[PDB]
């Protein structure tokens, strides 16, 4: 229903001062609404052109790697048609599988050439986002990361790193993070790549 | 591995502080403090007499679980699942559901569907997502629907905070966070805390 919006509107209202570019607080926003966390407003902190950067690779149709179940079956497929997306959960693949296994789904993903131009959702494994910074150093090229892991350990190091690489990205300060924030921003912004950016 | 995440329950364990919680309700505030790295969980997380037993029984007997979002289906972890092997039902999504709404509130088909199914009785309910879910299911409650346990964590600016108070009154064991907080993840916490602590036969051995 309309809840969306009218959850929206209590949000926008009730978010107080919020400095983020006209494209990037709708990011944040639903971040918030996905959490009743306003803390978020504070905390997420994007790269330059980290938008603009999600709303082409989602336009061209990129591939969303991400690095836990609960991501994948989040994201509402009625939004991932659109765009046509295919989102590849690696740690579950039958290959990596076979094979910490956050290092051999980044392997899998060296071997394939996925890692260039798509998206990247991390919101659990630390160490799988140090598997990335450091094949980002190793010339992997990735549209955009999301680094939003939840946790105690690796966690400020892995984000550290990773608001120090070469790439686009949109990050969770902190120890805060998890599978519903990088759900959330997905969704925010395949609902803006829908909108024109509006 | 699994090193890690004993490590991080016990950096929970030292930075959480005093708190009124139960030796059976503790490990579940903890892992739901562990999975968000929100330490206002310990102020949030209510219990009702009974609820954590009322949990780790239905657990054991086999109690199906019914939750209102594929997140939480698809965050439980199978490996857990399979130790008392608890069926996971996903109603808001189900064909069945889904069928009836678009015929004639998704979230209703949902409850009346699961009722008339016969999967209330015996079961854990998780809901993290839809509040209108959490209100059908609570009348459904004062009609004879009698769940081993629900967990009433819907997150949200709309019905969430009556959702719960419709929940925290009700003839039903259940966990609750108090507020606008919640969510997808606290319910697989919850429940994998549950899990862990009827696999350890009611002993927090972490
Ligand atoms: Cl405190």
Redesign the interface.
């Known amino acids: 229903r309309a809840?969306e919006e009218?959850?929206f509107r209590?949000?926008d209202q009730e978010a107080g001062p919020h400095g983020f570019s006209p494209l990037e607080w709708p990011v944040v926003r639903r971040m918030i609404?996905?959490?009743?966390?306003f803390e978020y407003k504070a905390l997420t902190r994007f790269s330059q052109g980290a938008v603009e950067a999600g709303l082409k690779a989602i336009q061209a149709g990129a591939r969303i790697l991400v690095d836990?179940?609960?991501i994948?079956?989040?994201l509402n497929p009625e939004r991932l048609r659109l765009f046509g997306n295919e989102v590849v959960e690696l740690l579950a693949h039958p290959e990596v599988v076979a094979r910490?296994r956050a290092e051999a789904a980044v392997a899998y993903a060296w071997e394939k050439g996925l890692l260039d131009g798509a998206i990247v959702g991390v919101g659990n494994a630390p160490t799988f986002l140090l598997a990335l910074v450091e094949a980002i150093r190793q010339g992997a090229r990735p549209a955009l990361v999301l680094g939003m892991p939840?946790?105690?350990?690796?966690?400020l190091e892995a984000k550290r790193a990773l608001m120090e690489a070469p790439v686009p990205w949109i990050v969770t300060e902190?120890?805060?993070?998890?599978?519903?924030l990088v759900?959330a921003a997905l969704h925010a912004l395949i609902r803006l790549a829908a909108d024109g950016g509006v």
């Open positions: 809840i009218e959850s209590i949000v609404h996905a959490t009743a966390d836990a179940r609960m994948a079956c989040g910490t939840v946790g105690f350990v690796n966690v902190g120890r805060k993070g998890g599978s519903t759900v």
